[PDB]
Every structure is written in C-alpha cells, then in structure tokens.
Amino acid sequence: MIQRTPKIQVYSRHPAENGKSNFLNCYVSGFHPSDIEVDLLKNGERIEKVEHSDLSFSKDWSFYLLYYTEFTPTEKQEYACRVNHVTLSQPKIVKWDRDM
C-alpha cells in the first residue's frame, strides 16, 4: 500500500481564445489513493456548478485532478479550494491569492 497527500494549487487563467473569460482552478496533484472530495468555495460556500473535473494518473499510484470553472471575481470576494482525503485529518482549505 502507498498513500500520498495531495499538493493543492489554486489559480486563475484566461483562455487565450477568449481572454475576457476567467477560470478558477484547483490543481490537486500526486495523491493516492484516488478517493477524494474537492470543492471550489466562494466566501466559504461550495460552488455547485464546476464545469470541468479532469482526472489522470501517471504511475498507477499517482493521481492528478484539475477542477476548474468560469468565474467572475471581485476584490471583496474570497475564493478557495477545499480538499478532503484519507491523508488529511482535517479538510484542507487553500485560498486563492487575487494575484494568482
């Protein structure tokens, strides 16, 4: 058996083909087992509609999830990614840095 804690990165991207659109991303990497719970938050509340949830593995024991959706951030909103996994005794909340 192997278990590996996810690394979690939260960032925003503009697709170059539609630069006015803005996507909030949670990249959850190198975890095992694959069982996981991942939400994007807006001021502490789960975002219900996340349009993209892309899972892959490299080695049979290394998983990668890109969890992202279109958003419209304002300076006064707080965005984050919340991850639950067997390796995390408490849910891990990673805040979006506005400049990322």
Numbering used by the authors: 0 to 99
Show passages lifted from the paper.
Here, we report the use of the TPBLA to explore the role of the protein sequence in determining the aggregation of the naturally amyloidogenic protein, β2m. Another example is β2m, in which aggregation of the wild-type (WT) protein is associated with the deposition of amyloid fibrils in the joints of patients undergoing long-term renal dialysis (dialysis-related amyloidosis [DRA]).
Comparison of the crystal structures of D76E-, D76A-, D76S-, D76G-, D76Q-, D76Y-, and D76K-β2m with those of WT- and D76N-β2m revealed no substantial differences that could explain their different stabilities and aggregation propensities (RMSD < 0.6 Å over all heavy atoms). Interestingly, two of the most rapidly aggregating variants (D76N- and D76Q-β2m) share an amide sidechain. D76N-, D76Q-, and D76M-β2m, which have intermediate in vivo growth scores, aggregate the most rapidly. For other variants, the loop structure is maintained despite these hydrogen bonds either not forming (D76A-, D76G-, and D76Y-β2m), or being reduced in number (D76K-β2m hydrogen bonds to N42, and D76S-β2m hydrogen bonds to N42 and T73).
